[PDB]
């Protein structure tokens, strides 16, 4: 483009899409489970992933992931939502934060626990 052309048209700023409408630029969002089901992986994987559709505060609703092993989430459980997708279950684009509201931590888990919201146990 000739200089003149830039004086006319000018360059166009990029601007990107919010990979996550968790809403008011929120850290996280709270919500209640509409369903608690078990979907199945994509391309070359195979399994039964524990997922829950959540009715957010923002009148919304999204399928969300349940981390860890086993849980305690029913048709009316509250919950807080974190937001990272899952390169495997088209649909899910937010994660459930373990250990807040009606969401237990991960039972008997000892390794990395920030993630998975299990308390530090006593050694005795």
């Amino acid at each position: 483009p000739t200089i003149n052309q830039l004086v006319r048209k000018g360059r166009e700023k990029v601007r990107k899409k919010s990979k996550v409408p968790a809403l008011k630029g929120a850290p996280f969002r709270r919500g209640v489970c509409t369903v608690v089901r078990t979907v199945t992986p994509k391309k070359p994987n195979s399994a039964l992933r524990k997922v829950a559709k959540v009715r957010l505060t923002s009148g919304y609703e999204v399928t969300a992931y349940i981390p860890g092993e086993g849980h305690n989430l029913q048709e009316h459980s509250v919950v807080l939502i974190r937001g990272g997708r899952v390169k495997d279950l088209p649909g899910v684009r937010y994660h459930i934060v373990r250990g807040v509201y009606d969401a237990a931590g991960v039972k008997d888990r000892k390794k990395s626990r920030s993630k998975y919201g299990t308390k530090k146990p006593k050694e005795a």
Binding site: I3, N4, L6, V7
Partner: protein
């Protein structure tokens, strides 16, 4: 200093007033190249002395009417309709920009 400007009278169809077209230049804030840009100022003419096509100096004068904050300072050069022709054409080209 009461600002001054130099431009052509491009409309003389008011009672005691002229539209003075006024050009300015400057380097472009990012792409350098000097660029042309203009405004139009409505100019008091209590003697309707100034006719169409005249290049003139204007001066930052006291508010005479709405839209009208400049008095016609003094003549710079009569007979310059060639610039007026540029204005009026630019304007006439607009008709061919609608639907």
């Amino acid at each position: 200093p009461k600002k001054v400007l130099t431009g052509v009278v491009v409309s003389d169809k008011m009672q005691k007033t002229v539209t003075v077209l006024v050009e300015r230049q400057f380097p472009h804030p990012l792409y350098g190249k000097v660029i042309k840009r203009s405004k139009k100022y409505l100019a008091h003419d209590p003697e309707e002395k100034y006719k169409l096509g005249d290049v003139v100096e204007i001066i930052e004068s006291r508010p005479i009417s709405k839209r009208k904050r400049f008095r016609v300072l003094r003549l710079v050069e009569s007979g310059r309709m060639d610039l007026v022709e540029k204005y009026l054409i630019r304007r006439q080209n607009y008709e061919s920009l609608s639907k």
